[PDB]
Coordinates of C-alpha atoms in Angstrom, one line a residue:
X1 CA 0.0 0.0 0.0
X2 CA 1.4 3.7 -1.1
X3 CA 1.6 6.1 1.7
X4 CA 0.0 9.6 0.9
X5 CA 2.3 12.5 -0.7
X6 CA 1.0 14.7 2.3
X7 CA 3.2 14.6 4.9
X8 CA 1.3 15.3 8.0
X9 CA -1.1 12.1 7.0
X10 CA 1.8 10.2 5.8
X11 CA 3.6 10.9 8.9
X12 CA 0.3 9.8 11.1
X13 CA 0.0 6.5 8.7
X14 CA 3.6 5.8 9.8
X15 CA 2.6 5.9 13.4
X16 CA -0.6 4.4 13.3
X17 CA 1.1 1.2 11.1
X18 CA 4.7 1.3 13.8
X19 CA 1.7 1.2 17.1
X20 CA -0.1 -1.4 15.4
X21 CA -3.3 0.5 15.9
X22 CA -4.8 4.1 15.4
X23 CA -5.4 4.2 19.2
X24 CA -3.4 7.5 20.7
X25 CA -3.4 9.1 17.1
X26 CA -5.3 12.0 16.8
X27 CA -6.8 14.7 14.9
X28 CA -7.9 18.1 17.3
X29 CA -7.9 15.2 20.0
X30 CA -10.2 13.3 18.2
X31 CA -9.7 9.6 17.2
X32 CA -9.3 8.3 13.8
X33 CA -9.4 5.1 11.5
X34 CA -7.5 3.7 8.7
X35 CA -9.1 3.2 5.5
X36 CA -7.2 0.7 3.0
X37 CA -8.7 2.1 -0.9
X38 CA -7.5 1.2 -4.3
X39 CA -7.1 4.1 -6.8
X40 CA -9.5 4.3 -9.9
X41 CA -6.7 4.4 -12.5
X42 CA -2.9 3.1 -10.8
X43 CA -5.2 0.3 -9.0
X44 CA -2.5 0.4 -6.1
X45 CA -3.2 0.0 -3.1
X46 CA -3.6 3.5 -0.3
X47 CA -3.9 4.5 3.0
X48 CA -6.8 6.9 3.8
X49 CA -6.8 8.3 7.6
X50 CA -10.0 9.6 8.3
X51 CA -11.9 11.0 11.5
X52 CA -13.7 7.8 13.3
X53 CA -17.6 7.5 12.8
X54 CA -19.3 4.7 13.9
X55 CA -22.3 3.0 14.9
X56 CA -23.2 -0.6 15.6
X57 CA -20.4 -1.7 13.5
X58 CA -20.4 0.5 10.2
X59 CA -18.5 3.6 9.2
X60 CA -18.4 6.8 7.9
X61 CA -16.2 8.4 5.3
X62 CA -16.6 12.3 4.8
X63 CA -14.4 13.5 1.7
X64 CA -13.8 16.7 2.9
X65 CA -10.1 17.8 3.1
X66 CA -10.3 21.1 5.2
X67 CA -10.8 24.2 3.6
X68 CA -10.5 22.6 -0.1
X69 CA -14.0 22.3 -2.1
X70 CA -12.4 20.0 -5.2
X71 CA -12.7 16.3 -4.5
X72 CA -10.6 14.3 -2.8
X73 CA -8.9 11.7 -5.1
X74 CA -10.1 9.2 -2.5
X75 CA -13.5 10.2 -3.4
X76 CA -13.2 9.0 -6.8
X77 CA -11.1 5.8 -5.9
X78 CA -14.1 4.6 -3.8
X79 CA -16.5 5.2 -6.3
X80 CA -14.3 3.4 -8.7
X81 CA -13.5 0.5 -6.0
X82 CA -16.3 0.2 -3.6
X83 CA -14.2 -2.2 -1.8
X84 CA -12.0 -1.0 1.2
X85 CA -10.6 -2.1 4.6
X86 CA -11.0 -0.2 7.8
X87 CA -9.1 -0.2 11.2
X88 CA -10.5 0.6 13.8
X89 CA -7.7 0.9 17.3
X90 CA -5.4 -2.7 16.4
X91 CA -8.8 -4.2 14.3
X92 CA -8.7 -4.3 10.9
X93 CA -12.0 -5.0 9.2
X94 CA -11.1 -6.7 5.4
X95 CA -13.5 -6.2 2.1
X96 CA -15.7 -3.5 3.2
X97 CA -17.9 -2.2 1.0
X98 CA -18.1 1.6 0.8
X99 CA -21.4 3.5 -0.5
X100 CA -22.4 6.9 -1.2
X101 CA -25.2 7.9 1.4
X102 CA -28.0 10.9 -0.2
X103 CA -31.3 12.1 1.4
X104 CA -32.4 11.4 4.7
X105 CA -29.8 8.6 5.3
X106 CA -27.4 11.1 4.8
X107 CA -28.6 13.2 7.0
X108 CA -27.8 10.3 9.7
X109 CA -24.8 9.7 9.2
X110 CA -23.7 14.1 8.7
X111 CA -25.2 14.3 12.1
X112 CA -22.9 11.6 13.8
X113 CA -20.0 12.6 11.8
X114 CA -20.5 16.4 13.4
X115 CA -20.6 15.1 16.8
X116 CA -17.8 13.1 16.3
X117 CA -15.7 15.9 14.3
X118 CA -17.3 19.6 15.6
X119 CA -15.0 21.0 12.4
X120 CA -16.9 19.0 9.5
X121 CA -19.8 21.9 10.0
X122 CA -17.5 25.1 9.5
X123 CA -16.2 22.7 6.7
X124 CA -20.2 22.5 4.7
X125 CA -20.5 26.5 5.7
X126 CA -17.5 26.9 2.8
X127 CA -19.4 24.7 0.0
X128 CA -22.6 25.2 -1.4
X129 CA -23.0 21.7 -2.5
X130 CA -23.5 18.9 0.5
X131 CA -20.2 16.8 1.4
X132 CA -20.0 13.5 0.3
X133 CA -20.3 11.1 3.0
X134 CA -19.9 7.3 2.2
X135 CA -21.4 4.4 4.6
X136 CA -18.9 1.5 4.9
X137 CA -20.5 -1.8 5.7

């Protein structure tokens, strides 16, 4: 698996994969869990880190790098390759499937992501379109 090009989430990929879990690695002291994705066009393997949401045993991803509007590539990888691992503290859950939530169940998942990750609000209030949030189950 390719570790990103960014060095503050390469650097935290490092850690999290030298621990042996994400536990301890934070974000604005807020925990987070490794996605394993497969790019749309290089099909290599790469390590996401995104904030943790959960709830009885699914996931959350919300493509929404900070103050950037533009996609993350990420985004597009898991469109292209539904499939993905997450890790969760030292448990990695294999062949995931990732889908892109709309509507109401949306709405679910947005509202546990924000009281997980305060930040992911002031992140919409600099869009106009709705951030993508994907359901991994």
């Amino acid at each position: 698996a390719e570790l990103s090009p960014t060095d503050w989430v390469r650097e935290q990929t490092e850690r999290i994969l030298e621990q042996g879990t994400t536990d301890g690695v934070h974000v604005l002291d807020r925990p987070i869990v490794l996605f394993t994705t497969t790019g749309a066009k290089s099909g290599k393997k790469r390590y996401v880190p995104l904030m943790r949401v959960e709830e009885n045993g699914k996931y959350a991803m919300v493509a929404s790098k900070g103050g950037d509007p533009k996609h993350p590539s990420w985004y597009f990888n898991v469109k292209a390759n539904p499939t993905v691992s997450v890790q969760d503290g030292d448990k990695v859950l294999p062949d995931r499937t990732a889908r892109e939530l709309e509507g109401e169940e949306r709405e679910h998942w947005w509202k546990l992501a924000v009281e997980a990750y305060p930040p992911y609000a002031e992140y919409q209030t600099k869009t106009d379109r709705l951030i993508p949030v994907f359901i991994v189950e």
